[PDB]
């Protein structure tokens, strides 16, 4: 998304996965925390600019 210069779409994409993970009922709380933490940490490693 950001390769085209549109950060808002990237934020929407991140939120879509975060909210999809949050509302699932087939996994336990610790797995919900683990997946969210891993995805959030991995997201920072791919930013290509200070903005």
């Amino acid at each position: 998304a950001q390769q085209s210069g549109d950060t808002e779409q990237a934020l929407q994409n991140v939120n879509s996965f975060i909210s999809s993970v949050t509302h699932d009922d087939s996994i336990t709380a610790e797995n919900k925390i683990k997946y969210t933490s891993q995805f959030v940490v991995n997201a920072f490693a791919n930013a290509n600019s200070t903005g």
Binding site: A1, Q3, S4, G5, D6, Q9, Q12, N13, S16, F17, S19, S20, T22, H23, D24, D25
Partner: protein
């Protein structure tokens, strides 16, 4: 299935850009691909409008918006590249004729 579709659309975007297909052929392909997934989702669950399926639809929407956005910018870059190359080619012949 959702993960495969998400990557498939993005991968097909550049393949269509490289062949110079018109936007209509991309839009019809996008609609046809979305229809199959939507129909398949009718058996893999009730699709009852609860929180999880609402989130699923929300992700599906952006999965299309992102590719629709990228398709324009790819062609925008390609047109400028081709214009620069054509302008260089036009300038070579002027020097050729001047020397001749």
């Amino acid at each position: 299935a959702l993960a495969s579709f998400q990557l498939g659309l993005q991968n097909t975007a550049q393949q269509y850009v490289n062949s110079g297909k018109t936007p209509e052929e991309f839009n019809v392909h996008v609609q046809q691909q979305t229809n199959q997934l939507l129909q398949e989702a009718g058996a893999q669950g009730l699709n009852l409008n609860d929180k999880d399926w609402q989130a699923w639809l929300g992700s599906v929407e952006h999965s299309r918006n992102t590719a629709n956005a990228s398709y324009q910018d790819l062609n925008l870059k390609r047109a400028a590249v081709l214009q620069e190359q054509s302008w260089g080619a036009r300038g070579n012949a002027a020097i050729a004729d001047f020397v001749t």
